[PDB]
Design a protein around this ligand. Structure first.
Ligand code: NA
Lengths: 281, 281, 281
């Protein structure tokens, strides 16, 4: 079985400057609170060990999700492009933006497009100026992304902002309503508001869900899996959130889940493949 | 066993001018997403075939829920009365209002009463002037309805408005709080906010839930069925949302759910009968 | 197995003036709707029968949560401290505040501390002027409590206020964010917003959950138990909400729950012992 991990941040270049690597202590406590042991590759910050674990898990490719955050640390978009070009068979680059203004957002989007990157990651709740995903100042960017076929990853689950209002499903739903042709991926799957996000997915055909780490032994698990076996088969994206979860143990667990095999193939690989090929029109 | 469908919109007269029939592409998309195949009678727009499917499903009566909506299309209240008087042993009429002002809401309620209809349907999130169910402008109407024993159906689940805020349980909860003797039916059962709406129903004894289409293989399913076997036995209403769901397959699926027979009788007909007899006091 | 009941209001001087005892009719209607029969000790208002019922269920100690409320009645803090001193082996006193002005709140907090009580209960949604738990006017009190190691019980589940907004998880989450060293216990466990509150508890290590009566055959049950068997073993507190639930039947049922033995020990008594010993640093 082929697997594309929709959230894999390798221990390479600028990724090591993000808090996921600069604060191994915080990360490891989070990993253990979830129910996993830290991945040896993550703890040793070894790309070599990561590649072994990746192959042993059955993961053929990883989506290298960029990050630019005052709160959570930063990897340069140039470094994300550099990691992907170094291993072009193994990695897909996703650029990120941290902006106070709409002009800063477009300058950075253009920087991303100049690197050949065609997907962007927005985590505005952990920016220097924290904002909701439906903040007015982000609307010109969504307009650009919608017009140019750029899919948008947005962190609308987990600790997406200062408090739980930053995950209320009203924020992602407004964006989807206002930009009906914009391809959106919700990283952390808008957890914990899971009954609600399944409705949003039901209503808004261009939303993909990626609960990633929060799929594991938490509220909403059964809701995600039920939807996976129905309409969400084409719109769920497998992801480990590595280094937050181990590649091996998360994937092995995932493959045992009662998701019907045709939906399993879509969720593990098929959907990501379609989205990644679609990116940039 | 007697079955009263609390949400059946027949392919007859002005019902055929509503988006549920004028846009079968939108309807069939939701139907297939739910996991059903479109009903032959819906696709054919045949009242004859609907009567066949209705009889085969074991459904003796349907509640013809009128609709007046800029977004979703409209059926005159006179058309609704006409359908019911044409088949008085098959159909119960429910009037609908679309208003910008409280006086327009009154004038339409009076028009409904003049037709001998004694239950009203409000879907204010899909009006030309969209509003929440707890909008100040609707309060005079709720006052009149409470004082005159008129049950109100209100769409507070599913795609009730422009975005998910139109299903936030705060809106229905305030209405129930401010009008504690007003009989209220939440059509689509305030889905997706199911953990929340069970609390609301627990607290507000005048609230009836009708999850209808959204009971099918979606989040909250087990919460609704748990409540149905306990305190909500007297306050849940069977409904298909036909033409959104086929009569046969929905009803056959409903009939095998784990609901004790005395709650099952109430939910299939007993609760609807009491409400229909109550209506107009 | 030793048990500490984190919500047990005895039929003793003062507590008898609250609506839990002055309206046995409303109370018994709730108890039966939940699915229990009223405790004989509650019905007969006998401290004598209560101790028998406690000992039979294995409840060694009860937390006599004081109440000061316009909506739900009041019991003076002196009366709470006097129940505890009459039975020092059986009862832990918890003070309560109802205040309009913060100088009223601070005089009441001082009174509590003078009475030897080291835990305060806040139910601001049921005060004469209802307010949310994150109301700016409560921040001085939280700051005092945080600096002086006073744990705060706050009712943020159930009928915590006039409507469901008074249990929206944004309110408790803000308090927890702005007072990260404050020990907070959510009485009624912030039910019905269970998927959400498990995230809040996951994020906010100072939060303890006591779902009490709402654990029983209601939405969120499986979420609470799953949390109890994972990260929340150290932060869940057994309680019956007596007289709302019978000591005998609630406790017997709770003991049959699939909670791993070391978590069962912590939740039944260990967590409370720790909290009660910590109280007042
Ligand atoms: Na919820």
């Amino acid at each position: 079985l082929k697997i594309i991990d929709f959230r894999l941040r390798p221990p390479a270049m600028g990724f090591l400057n993000a808090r996921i690597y600069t604060r191994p202590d915080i990360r490891n406590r989070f990993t253990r609170q979830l129910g996993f042991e830290p991945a040896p590759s993550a703890e040793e910050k070894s790309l070599e060990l990561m590649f072994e674990e990746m192959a042993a898990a059955g993961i053929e490719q990883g989506v290298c999700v960029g990050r630019n955050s005052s709160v959570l640390g930063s990897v340069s978009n140039a470094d994300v492009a550099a990691v992907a070009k170094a291993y072009p068979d193994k990695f897909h680059p996703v650029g990120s933006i941290e902006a106070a203004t709409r002009k800063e957002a477009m300058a950075q989007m253009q920087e991303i497009l100049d690197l050949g990157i065609r997907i962007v990651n927005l985590e505005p709740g952990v920016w220097a100026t924290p904002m909701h995903v439906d903040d007015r100042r982000l609307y010109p960017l969504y307009a650009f992304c919608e017009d140019n076929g750029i899919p948008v990853i947005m962190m609308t689950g987990g600790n997406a902002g200062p408090d739980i209002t930053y995950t209320n499903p009203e924020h992602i739903d407004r964006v989807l309503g206002d930009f009906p042709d914009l391809t959106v991926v919700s990283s952390h799957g808008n957890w914990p508001w899971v009954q609600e996000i399944i409705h949003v997915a039901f209503r808004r055909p261009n939303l993909y869900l990626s609960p990633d780490m929060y799929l594991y032994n938490l509220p909403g698990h059964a809701d995600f899996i039920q939807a996976a076996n129905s309409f969400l088969a084409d719109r769920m994206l497998f992801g480990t959130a590595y280094p937050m979860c181990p590649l091996k143990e998360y994937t092995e667990w995932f493959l045992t889940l009662p998701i019907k095999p045709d939906a399993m193939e879509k969720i593990l690989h098929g959907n990501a493949e379609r989205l990644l090929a679609q990116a940039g029109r």
